[PDB]
Design a protein around this ligand. Structure first.
Ligand code: HEM
Ligand code: HEM
Lengths: 361, 361
């Protein structure tokens, strides 16, 4: 009743906006008629390859928290709405990792899986990211952010070796099944980068490493009223995400004090700004390491500079710019970028990516 | 008509809340009667020494953008509502600098001047801060943030030597005068700190320096409906304000590239994170310098730690905590403090400090 009404309204808004950008303004009338009859006949409608391809791009462009939006139109859209089995999904996820990694020269990609029909999911991905480390407790081992998902995986037959860098398996659920299935990731498919410093040799004593490609797999892609709960996407890392957050947060790997030790500075006084010096060196190490192994990465300055060019292009295209200041500013030297010195409208514009409730926990 | 109504409403709210914290709950009834008769007789009311003293403190406690709120109850309130002449104001401002500086051991203080009567100001301070550097243009000289006020001062007979660190004079306007008066600051009253590094001797080649005490003199203190447009206040600096903003912003002194040069690093590649390393060293220098000359300063870690204790005390006192995340997080290593990892309610609670339109510009 009310669900068939919201769907039609969001479809009219999307097709108009989408076709206007694609230069197919005359085809709007004939397409909306087909959609109206499709919603009445089945209860939903199917996007064309061109529609969801641009839809996923528009969704990226409207992502307020993303600093890499300059490259929105170069997104590699992989259409996998034809998957029916768990092997199909697995192979699609494996393919995503392979094609996105591209031997280091990372390609911003997204794999589209079947959307929700009558509110029920067809494929449901449990992983936050396709490649992520596990986490445990007695004393902290691994990535604390992954604790709940690690426990869920263990309740399904999976067991990790309990090192700080255990690769969580792929874990997803198919329509009609009560519990999800899991598949260990083939190591040959996963690129990892050991962290070393360009001037400090002792840095390798920390035995730090991180994976090459972040692939967010738990967000919902909303395009024209259609909910693609399963649609993993990826870009390349921005150094700070690793050296200022993942390896620095007290609630994550908490490595600042150990970094200070290998670089030769004391952790006695705050006034010595040891945490800051540790952050700079750890972040330099991250950037040097990724570049050395031939894996794409971008520093926060270059990234902000690229985002500045994005702001200019949106003004040039006549589109309103939206952004979340609190997420756009880098966690290291934010005042050194232009983002800090201006304000952004945090309005939500569709199509976009949204958060969804975690099946575990 | 409507002005006498708003005033009475804000007075009832303030006296109740103020006396409840002071343990004088029974005196509320008799005090509100006197106030009601005072508003009818004159059109406004006069605070008691105890009322505005605690009012200024409560105002500090409600300042969402302030990280040093832990020390709210130790505020040194100086009552100068008895000033009538321009010499009175000048001496009060001179006194403020002297007593607040306290030979380096800075004392958080506030000088209260007469409030607005029928919407018109009695004393109007033009300075953003009592002690601040001037700014000019052909090529950039001094502090760009002070350009407009510097031009206004020059249109009044004042002329600076055009160095990067010229002290702007005190400039204020008395009721009944069309234009403001100005007084040069006595150098013996102003403590300045030359910036040097603990390990790098070449740092002094940058010839950087900053003043010791920041005294915001252009904000409005609102207590119980009474508007104290002139009420300068001060705390001590947090290193980052100087080394990550005042001396780092491209729109301020823009010293990062010159800092990189004296510390021995290249400014060629962003991936080398030279801006970040420059920021750490400049900030360490700031903290070491202030401490060396015996002038109070606090690093961002200690400051966040102190703010954490403030959050706990407000929960313990039963008061709702308000804060602006975007201003509370430090501009250097924000994720290394607890502030970054939580959210804050940006609701405005009175009494508080507000922005007011600049008479110049
Ligand atoms: C191409 C390079 C990319 C860079 C450098 C970049 C960078 C960033 C950064 C630094 C954040 C903050 C992450 C954090 O602090 O947790 C972010 C968030 C985000 N970005 Fe990207 N991004 C890229 C590509 C993409 C792509 C391919 C999409 C989608 C098609 C996208 C969607 C978003 C979304 C929705 C968020 C918020 C996610 C969250 O709330 O956890 N980004 N991005
Ligand atoms: C005692 C030590 C103090 C410290 C360490 C401290 C620190 C800070 C910091 C770091 C900011 C940000 C400044 C910027 O980024 O421009 C701030 C803003 C502010 N603080 Fe403080 N503060 C202190 C005392 C005070 C006192 C004495 C009051 C008032 C009685 C106060 C009122 C505020 C207000 C209203 C703002 C916002 C001002 C603006 O928007 O420009 N603070 N504080």
């Amino acid at each position: 009743g009310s669900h068939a009404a919201i769907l039609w309204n969001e479809a009219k808004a999307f097709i108009a906006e989408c076709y206007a950008e694609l230069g197919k303004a005359e085809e709007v009338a004939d397409r909306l008629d087909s959609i109206k009859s499709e919603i009445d006949r089945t209860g939903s409608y199917v996007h064309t390859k061109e529609e969801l391809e641009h839809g996923a791009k528009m969704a990226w462009r409207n992502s307020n928290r993303c600093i890499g939006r300059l490259f929105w139109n170069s997104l590699n859209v992989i259409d996998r709405r034809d998957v029916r089995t768990k092997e199909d999904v697995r192979d699609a996820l494996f393919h995503h990792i392979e094609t996105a990694t591209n031997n280091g020269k990372i390609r911003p990609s997204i794999t589209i899986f079947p959307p929700e029909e009558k509110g029920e999911k067809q494929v449901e991905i449990w992983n936050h990211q396709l490649i992520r480390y596990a986490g445990y407790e007695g004393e902290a081992i691994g990535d604390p952010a992954s604790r709940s998902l690690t426990a869920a995986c263990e309740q399904l037959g999976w067991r990790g070796e309990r090192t700080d860098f255990d690769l969580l398996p792929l874990i997803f659920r198919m329509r009609g099944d009560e519990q999800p299935v899991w598949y260990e990731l083939p190591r040959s498919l996963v690129i990892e980068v050991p962290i070393t410093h360009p001037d400090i040799e002792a840095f390798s004593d920390l035995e730090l490493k991180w994976y090459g490609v972040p692939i967010i797999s738990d967000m919902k892609l909303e395009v024209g009223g259609i909910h693609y709960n399963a649609a993993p996407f990826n870009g390349w890392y921005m150094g700070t995400e690793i050296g200022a957050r993942n390896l620095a947060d007290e609630k994550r790997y908490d490595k600042l004090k150990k970094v200070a030790s290998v670089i030769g500075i004391s952790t006695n006084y705050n006034t010595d700004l040891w945490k800051d010096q540790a952050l700079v060196e750890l972040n330099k190490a991250v950037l040097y390491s990724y570049k050395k192994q031939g894996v794409s990465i971008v520093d926060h300055h270059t990234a902000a500079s690229q985002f500045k060019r994005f702001e200019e292009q949106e003004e040039e295209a006549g589109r309103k710019l939206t952004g979340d200041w609190t997420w756009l500013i880098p966690p290291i030297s934010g005042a050194a970028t232009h983002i800090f010195h201006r304000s952004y409208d945090n309005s939500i514009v569709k199509p976009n990516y949204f958060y969804q409730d975690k099946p575990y926990e």
